[PDB]
Design a protein around this ligand. Structure first.
Ligand code: R3M
Ligand code: R3M
Ligand code: R3M
Ligand code: R3M
Ligand code: CA
Ligand code: CA
Ligand code: CA
Ligand code: CA
Ligand code: MN
Ligand code: MN
Ligand code: MN
Ligand code: MN
Lengths: 237, 237, 237, 237
């Protein structure tokens, strides 16, 4: 069983699993059933930006999702990540479609992690930035339907050759290196992730979402995690 | 009068102006009477580290102070800094001694500030890092008794040639450029500051401490602000 | 008398003072008569990118200027800046027009400087990034006709309210803090500068160009330096 | 066979394979016989620093190795890495011993690589920093004898529990993620690596040295590459 901590941008309300009745962002700790949610005015066909941040002093995971000239959506949850995640993790982007669909296009993605130790007071750090993705992107582990390099973008779910999204699709990109996301003797450990995304559907009703996640390093897409499970979780519990 | 936000490392309790009875760290919002404090076991003669963080999403100002292999002191305070500080500020370090005294040596100092705006979703950033200081540190504004370049360090308060700290002293160092700390159309604004410091005293009670601070751009040491007022405040209100 | 090292993007050939016969980029060392030039195919009304790099092992000053899908222009020159510049400098952007004109619009400007010292092997750093400019950009020193905040851009030279550039104009923007560009006891010093620019003109001959520049700190626009002198030199010697 | 680009810190002169008659630094392009070398006064039992840099514009690989308060050794060589390395590489540190020996202790290692592409003018970047190494260091592929976590250091070759180095030992540590060190449509690509090291020995001629290297991603320690081959090269050609 994978251990997953995620920020979801959920375009599709599954109220039978506790989604609120509108598109929303959410903080998920080991369950697709978010611990905290906020209303999110998703705009179909427009480029937005997400930002996720955490530090071990406040022990607060927070995210803001925004479109230019619009009010942002923000959500926050108090959680000690060293009580949840293993010491080493991978970081990644997940998306999915079900019986409804949307393109789940990533235009850019960056991540910074820092860990300062208490025995020495010295820092380890990891930064990456993709402002474009190439066809053979060897520092990403591409899972399920994820492909890269079409127009320099990362397409987490299937897009047909005429530009339309496909239903029942699930794809992830994980950064190739493990990340040391906490250490018992860190005075302060932090991270921040940013990604710009383009969710478009010719349907009145898009689905299902894109999430930023942190997992056990050996994580894979759970069996049948298309749809509301966002490529993250083996079931709806 | 100046507008000051600060994290203080207060080595000397002045309980007649509301300090805790022990050496403490504190978050000071336009007053020397800290909005929040925590017990801090200052170690006479050991090099310690301080980290200060804040972001516009959680609107939480937090600091950790620690020495190698000791429990850290942490203090935090919910505060929207866009309601407190002008849009443009200077950042700095300050220290004083009074009738009791200590060296207030800075061995390094770094700072990072970022603003991502909401009309363009583009980010401005300022980073600086000092891991030694030179005799002529042209990018620092020294006030009061502050000097640099003695052993490559920043001495915030006055030290004799035989290395002994002096009483009734006060000294500040500000980074030279104004810093854009918030902006009305920013999706996320954040900063982080680190410094390493060395407080040594021949007295049984060292006084008075060291602060990291954020101020109006034209800020200067208030008249009479040696001792308990830390070079930051004009009175004890 | 100022000391200027500059990379010029020279849009107007003044062959009577050594310019090649075509738009060109150049490295200037204390003279507007370039020590080295490369052919530059400036594209009217297109947003381009310029990159400037130097380090104190190579002692080589190099620049690349390009537009999306074109061949870049590159120019490199061998010079120890230890011998040319003072130890503390300001970095800047400058631009001018004379009888002929162009908008000299900067859309982004970044700069990183790093110094690692010989006695301690410790490391000082300055980084700034502007991806937009506001109306009151307090960490810029604005000289001559330079203004910021028009469309979130920096217009180095005078533009009418109707969008039209003006002749006989000169402007500059310097970063506010002095920069420690070399230190006698450095194992390696380096810097990198990036800006993006937009040069539009109604004229068959656009004039005069834009420059990234490094100067004595107290530098100012030399009297008469519009047009060919690019806001940098007192004369064409 | 592997494709290797290295900067070597060669503490033992093997004059039969073309080493000069002293300890030296060298640039190795797919052969252990350096394309350029400089004399290097290795100091037995002192912590030194090495900095290596390159960019695609000058196309010059350069390195400085230094001890506090000593003259640095520097070496440089004009080489287009486009023409030598594949598009994706791994980066690492290698060391060896042979009949003579020495501890090959890494106390810190940093690396930064950037690509600006010419179709879009956007950058992809990778940065990593270790100031401490932990026992189970997941983002490093340790090959051969290399180990981590002893006093928070990376020991490239075998050292006994009593501090003494061992002969005929070879060990490498590779960062986990492949690095995109060039791309055909890049306006500029560059990198930088820094490491600090402690070579200590009971012998009068310590051996064999330490290298920072770049390789094909599936590179491993070639057969019998102890001693003078520095864990890099399958033979002396
Ligand atoms: C929120 C709107 N609601 C609640 C009142 C709703 C309810 C039922 C359907 C809904 C929608 O939509 C469809 C659409 C289709 N389409 C053709 C394949 C799309 C036009 C087929 C069946 C249904 C059904 C349906 C009707 C009869 C029998 C079975 C079902 C039906 O959807 O069966 C599969 C889902 O199982 C039923 C559990 O009911 C929960 C309520 N429901 C179902 C759905 C659609 O879910 C599917 O798509 C989602 C979006 O891609 C994914 O998050 C999810 O993982 C799954 O792939 N949402 N709400
Ligand atoms: C916390 C201990 N308490 C409260 C019961 C205390 C009270 C009085 C003194 C205290 C301590 O200490 C000294 C120390 C000295 N020294 C010689 C310079 C150092 C041994 C001289 C006079 C006093 C006096 C003293 C005795 C008789 C007449 C007047 C005074 C005396 O301190 O007069 C100066 C100001 O007195 C008003 C403050 O009254 C609050 C009680 N108090 C006084 C102090 C000493 O504060 C001075 O130094 C501090 C440490 O650097 C600063 O934070 C502060 O701004 C100031 O510079 N702290 N608590
Ligand atoms: C030497 C004889 N005298 C004084 C007795 C003289 C006086 C004025 C001119 C003179 C000559 O010649 C020209 C020639 C031109 N030409 C067209 C480019 C050459 C036919 C244009 C304006 C003037 C002028 C002129 C007339 C009216 C108003 C202004 C000027 C005027 O700008 O004059 C500068 C002196 O230029 C004479 C020699 O330059 C040779 C050809 N030249 C001139 C120019 C115009 O340059 C102006 O624009 C350039 C492009 O932005 C700048 O790089 C430059 O810094 C300056 O701001 N380019 N190429
Ligand atoms: C060619 C005749 N034969 C075969 C029967 C032969 C065999 C062994 C040796 C031979 C010769 O010569 C020497 C010479 C030395 N010398 C002191 C430097 C020269 C007198 C040291 C060890 C050996 C050895 C030797 C003795 C015991 C154990 C091993 C060897 C041993 O490793 O010998 C390797 C081949 O040595 C013959 C070529 O000699 C060139 C001069 N020499 C030898 C060495 C030591 O090299 C070793 O260490 C260096 C430093 O760690 C590494 O760079 C290097 O890759 C290797 O691990 N340096 N300079
Ligand atoms: Ca959902
Ligand atoms: Ca106090
Ligand atoms: Ca010209
Ligand atoms: Ca050798
Ligand atoms: Mn949800
Ligand atoms: Mn206090
Ligand atoms: Mn020119
Ligand atoms: Mn060699």
């Amino acid at each position: 069983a994978d251990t997953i901590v995620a920020v979801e941008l959920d375009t599709y309300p599954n109220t039978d699993i506790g989604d609120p009745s509108y598109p929303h962002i959410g903080i998920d700790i080991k369950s697709v059933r978010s611990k905290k949610t906020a209303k999110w005015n998703m705009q179909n066909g427009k480029v937005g930006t997400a930002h996720i941040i955490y530090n071990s002093v406040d022990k607060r995971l927070s995210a803001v999702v925004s479109y230019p000239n619009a009010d942002s959506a923000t959500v926050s949850y108090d959680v000690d990540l060293d009580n949840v995640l293993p010491e080493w993790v991978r970081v990644g982007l997940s998306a999915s479609t079900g019986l409804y669909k949307e393109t789940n296009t990533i235009l850019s993605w960056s991540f910074t992690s820092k860990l300062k130790s208490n025995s020495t007071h010295e820092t380890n750090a990891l930064h990456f930035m993709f402002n474009q993705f190439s066809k053979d992107q060897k520092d990403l582990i591409l899972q399920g339907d994820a492909t890269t390099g079409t127009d320099g973008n990362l397409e987490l779910t299937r897009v047909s050759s005429n530009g339309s999204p496909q239903g029942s699709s699930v794809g992830r990109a994980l950064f190739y290196a493990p990340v040391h996301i906490w250490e018992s003797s860190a005075v302060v450990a932090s991270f921040e992730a940013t990604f710009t995304f383009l969710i478009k559907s010719p349907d009145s009703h898009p689905a299902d979402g894109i999430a930023f996640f942190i997992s056990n390093i050996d994580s894979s897409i759970p069996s049948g995690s298309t749809g509301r499970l966002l490529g993250l979780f083996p079931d709806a519990n």
